[PDB]
Design a protein around this ligand. Structure first.
Ligand code: CL
Ligand code: CL
Ligand code: CL
Ligand code: CL
Ligand code: CL
Ligand code: CL
Lengths: 135, 154, 154, 154, 135
């Protein structure tokens, strides 16, 4: 139900291709926009005009799992193991607060743990990425 | 035919560790040059369809300060990214680099990455460079650059 | 004109250490593409005489398992081989890589090789990639690929 | 159109450590070839204006002799230099390489560098390769070479 | 005495070039296949049709010797020192069986030594690549 517009004999508007398909032939005065389902190992996740589907990539890394497999409507979704997060190319372990520091924010599989010094009256003194400051 | 050879703009180089888009290059000084392509804050925009050859050379360097850590496991990576126009989508064309241990034992460290490829581009598509540890980048024009030149029509 | 950009086929990757011919690439998905050249189990066959530019990007990667050896001296090498047609003969066009110590001290390791050259090819001649430690290859299309595109006639 | 693929001449390779100009290449054997360009003691002279693509692959290698030093911090670098004709001036087009610790712990060491670029050249301008630790160069034609081929007119 | 066939005015068969030579001009109705000796630092080791000789390569590595020098009929042949074998780029030493293992197959300059555990009644207990299991 979304519209763009090409031209040859006379400029006119016509429907975009829905997700899961790619544009194979523009809309003619006689025909509606021709859309064909994405070939295997490809996808489209919005209304578009591209004449080619988007390749499913990248491959899941070593310590990653496939959360959501590849579909014609969505890309592959990879997630790191528990206790790790994606840093550039590898799933590194979450930071470990040194003696005198305690984690304040947990570590998402997409973000590292945030540490911070304890307030007055606290003395953690522990090398742990899974323990706050103790009174 | 369209071409481009963009050298790193020293003045503008982020000081981080995680991936960042290098958003500043020279296009009209030294070896830096551009023809029938447009540049805008690190995004090289294609004006003319065709099969382009794309390349990128990136150099990292660092000096260990007196009393340095026993180890510094770095990821020195480059990513050449393409952004589609007919559909919002960004994907890696090429990627290179290596892990490195730039500890304090050795005073100085150097390392360069080179990637090259042959890709089909459309007018409107944008090319951009992404790297880790951008603060370690060598600012020389002969060190950190990326370019593109059309080879065939589609 | 003839060209080719072949990305590694993850599904088929030998699990050895010594040299092996990578006998499986994609030719019609993602960035993978081929024109006026033919592919057959890792052998890129030339159909049209001319001076071609050849390139190859190879990425190795590994994760050290809990309780790893103190040292692991590897040879990460790539060889771009040409096989003549008018006479049975195989020879290296290009070669690159480096020695590496991927011990257990560092949890993760990465390294990529890039070779590029300008060679005279004849119809019938075949190009193939050879590498050591193929089990360590990165399966991504932006990581492990090799291509070729004609530049001039003979 | 003009091109060149020059392979290292083993016979003539200086035995030093600091930068040196590699002044001896093959131009008519194996993959070595040259067309509408002239060579003279490592200096590749341009005869025809145009935008050329330039590349260079350099391989270093070494064997540790029984009873070797605990450390050997090397700088393995390559420089692709252009010498202007209308004005006496030499400048680096490209540069690559890395620092390396080729101590005695590992018996053998290997490492290769690859640089590639797109540059505007004029007739009379000369291209030359410079490297450190030339005594460690791999003499193979598939290992140490540099070339150039015209892509567009000016 | 081996034959192939080109064509221009009429297809016909003609002699291939012998080893040590390369084809410079095809056989014409009037002339026999023209073959010229391989230039220096090149060779040919079979009956062929190539118009160019094969380059002698590669260069011998660090711990290698020249078994057979380069000839117009055969390529250079390099061999590793005694106690070594060619692995990718370097002549590495033959594997050394750990305490409790004894070599069973020697190490060729092109292949590494094969080790194997000893049968019942044997206890080598030695780090040697040049000694089997002892009773
Ligand atoms: Cl500028
Ligand atoms: Cl910019
Ligand atoms: Cl495919
Ligand atoms: Cl294949
Ligand atoms: Cl020569
Ligand atoms: Cl010379």
């Amino acid at each position: 139900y979304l519209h763009y517009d090409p031209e040859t004999g006379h400029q006119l508007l016509c429907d975009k291709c829905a997700p899961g398909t790619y544009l194979k032939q523009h809309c003619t005065v006689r025909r509606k926009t021709l859309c064909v389902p994405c070939p295997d190992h490809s996808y489209t996740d919005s209304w578009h005009t591209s004449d080619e589907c988007v390749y499913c990539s990248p491959v899941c890394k070593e310590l990653q799992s496939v959360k959501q497999e590849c579909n014609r409507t969505h890309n592959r979704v990879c997630e790191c193991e528990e206790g790790r997060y994606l840093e550039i190319e590898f799933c590194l372990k979450h930071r470990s607060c040194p003696p005198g520091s305690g984690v304040v924010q947990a570590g998402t599989p997409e973000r590292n743990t945030v540490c911070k010094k304890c307030p007055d009256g606290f003395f953690s003194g522990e090398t742990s990425s899974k323990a706050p400051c103790i009174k | 035919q369209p071409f481009a050879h963009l050298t790193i703009n020293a003045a503008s180089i982020p000081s981080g560790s995680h991936k960042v888009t290098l958003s500043s290059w020279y296009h009209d000084r030294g070896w830096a040059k551009i023809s029938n392509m447009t540049l805008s804050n690190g995004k090289l925009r294609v004006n003319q369809d065709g099969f382009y050859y794309l390349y990128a050379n990136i150099c990292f360097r660092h000096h260990e300060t007196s009393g340095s850590v026993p180890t510094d496991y770095l990821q020195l990576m480059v990513y050449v990214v393409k952004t589609s126009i007919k559909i919002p989508s960004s994907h890696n064309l090429m990627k290179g680099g290596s892990t490195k241990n730039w500890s304090g034992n050795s005073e100085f460290h150097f390392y360069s990455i080179n990637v090259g490829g042959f890709f089909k581009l459309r007018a409107g598509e944008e090319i951009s460079i992404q790297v880790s540890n951008p603060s370690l980048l060598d600012p020389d024009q002969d060190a950190t650059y990326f370019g593109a030149f059309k080879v065939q029509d589609i």
